[PDB]
């Protein structure tokens, strides 16, 4: 593929269409 | 890590695979 | 008000927004 | 599930938050 | 909640997941 | 070519899009 | 409503400036 | 205002519901 | 109309809400 | 996992994150 | 169509690349 | 061109037109 600038939502969009149902964790450095 | 990098620099679909459940 | 159905992308996008930097898991298998 | 508390029915704003980490 | 940056059409979908069908006015400066 | 079905988040996101920096209601009890 | 000139049934991009503020 | 403020800064939840109908 | 500032998927899904079905081209510089 | 249904924006949303830089074309009438 | 590989029925994200430039 | 512009300048819903199919 191609690589992505992905922040905030987009992130999270991006791992609902890698995962899918499957799932995901989204987790942040704190 | 994901979450920065991917907003800081660039990264694949194969690198967000890593997430996965 | 009656809060809505949300599916797939939204309701990601709703746990973002909601958990922000706290992060979240999205685990749809359970 | 979450798609059970939340898309197939319908949940709080509240319900959510049980998700977060 | 946590607090969220919103900026833009981010913003609006942040009043719709918060507002629904109550409804919401959008008002930027001018 | 005939425009569409835009509903909830997707309703706002165009009125968000057409009305930008004048801004907008959403109303839907109306 | 809007949700009637436009989800319901389906309208112009004119329409939605119907309500622009 | 909420506009500005939310995207320069940051708001809560809380703060949105300040604009709803 | 007014003019929008534009970047990343929101110009993509702001050629959806212009073209629609007709459909449309995404062509950044290379 | 099975992959889903992409309607309308969602469809165009995931050629983007898919096709990035390279673009792509959203022809529905085909 | 791309409707038809992808929203009518369902593709891989592979698929989705049949499209990209 | 378009996608650089709209991103870095403004542009307008009629210039977005030159793009449809
Ligand atoms: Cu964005
Ligand atoms: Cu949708």
């Known amino acids: 593929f191609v690589n992505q600038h992905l922040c905030g939502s987009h992130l999270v969009e991006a791992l609902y269409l890698v995962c899918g149902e499957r799932g995901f964790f989204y987790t942040p450095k704190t | ?21």
Chains 1, 3, 5, 6, 9, 10 share one sequence.
């Open chain 2, 1 to 21: 890590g994901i979450v920065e990098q991917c907003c800081t620099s660039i990264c694949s679909l194969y690198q967000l695979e890593n997430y996965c459940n």
